[PDB]
């Protein structure tokens, strides 16, 4: 169903935004890989529409960052999460458990 | 701002959704090109995030269309609208004026 | 069929390359829109795989050009051609008939 | 060079194709992740055009997989390979050494 796909995409996009926002709040050493994986994991957890949303938002973020005023590691972390593997694989010591 | 981008992308996504539900509600002959153009035009007016959102949602919709036996014509209508040209170029006679 | 899709993509990608090459040879005033439309038209003429190839190569070219050391017009011309409309719509007066 | 990019993309596309036909010829149990990883690794070694080609072909293949009732696992294997990690991490016991 198209409607269900679009619903999941909307939920997933909010998950990706929550990952961004948390990353900015945490302001933490060597956590970028974790939040990349967490955003994608959360979003794909919604279903195909969420996983689709994770993928295109991920690629846009990567693009804009190469429009800069370790991409391969970022994309690896994105897909680690998007495929359902535990984002805490990349968790740095000390990162508050709220994240 | 990335924030601004995601915000516009959120607005554009709602614009696209509005186009889909309007098309289904209208249930009008040969109206797909109009609603494709209209959703893309509404989305792109929100700004760059809006046009980006309209572009990726458009491509996901094309994929669906091709997998269910005119996606080429609708993608042309998508771009027409996204580029800021009048969606009413594609308006079929009799389509209710609220749409 | 996946094989047929991949075959068309290969043919289409050679068409897009032929459009680029011709554009560089022609070195002509205000022909960029024409070659954009012609590359995409030729490639989509091969079938879905060709049209798919036209789309992703088009977006890569646009990207790299925004990585610069009228995008919307370019993309409009791309989709004009990709949808099967005559690329000579954008032909500038004088352009050699080989192109 | 854009030329260099398209050249590497052509090489990468052949690498990906080699992976598909090898997978079909091998006809081996639980081997999809290996061949996904391998095709992406071969392609990305060609350079940026090669990695780009592997990325868009990978996404077109994911779409097909989802439309025919593990695409998530294969996309992870895609990224593993594309990032330069050893494809043989996914190698199933007994897969002929020529592959």
What is the fold's blueprint, element by element?
Four copies of one chain form a homotetramer.
Chain A: H1 2-26, H2 32-44, H3 48-66, H4 71-82
PDB class: protein binding
Keywords: retinol transport, protein binding
Assembly: tetrameric
List descriptors.
homotetramer; 99 residues; mainly alpha; Topoisomerase I, Chain A, domain 4; globular
What's the short story on this structure?
Chain A is mainly alpha-helical and 99 residues long. Chain A has one domain (1-99): Orthogonal Bundle (Topoisomerase I, Chain A, domain 4), CATH 1.10.132.110. Chain A has helices spanning 2-26, 32-44, 48-66, 71-82.
CATH fourth-tier homologous superfamily of chain A: Serum amyloid A protein
Alpha carbon gyration radius of chain A: 13 Å
CATH class of chain A: Mainly Alpha
Provide the number of structural domains of chain A. 1
Count of runs of 4 or more consecutive helical residues of chain A = 4
The amount of helix of chain A comes to 55-70%
Order of helices and strands of chain A: HHHH
- Counting helices, strands and paired strands, the structural category of chain A is mainly alpha
Largest sheet of chain A: none
The largest chain-to-chain contact, stated as pair and per-chain residue counts, equals: A-D, 15 and 12 residues
N-to-C CA distance of chain A: 33 Å
Apparent shape of chain A: globular
Strand content of chain A: under 5%
Oligomer: homotetramer
């Amino acid at each position: 169903r198209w409607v269900q796909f679009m619903k999941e995409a909307g939920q997933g996009s909010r998950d990706m935004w929550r990952a961004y926002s948390d990353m900015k709040k945490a302001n933490w050493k060597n956590s970028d890989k974790y939040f990349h994986a967490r955003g994608n994991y959360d979003a794909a957890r919604r279903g195909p529409g969420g996983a689709w949303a994770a993928k295109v938002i991920s690629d846009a973020r990567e693009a804009v960052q190469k429009f800069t005023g370790d991409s391969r590691a970022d994309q690896f972390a994105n897909e680690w999460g998007r495929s359902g593997k535990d984002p805490n694989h990349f968790r740095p010591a000390g990162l508050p458990k709220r994240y």
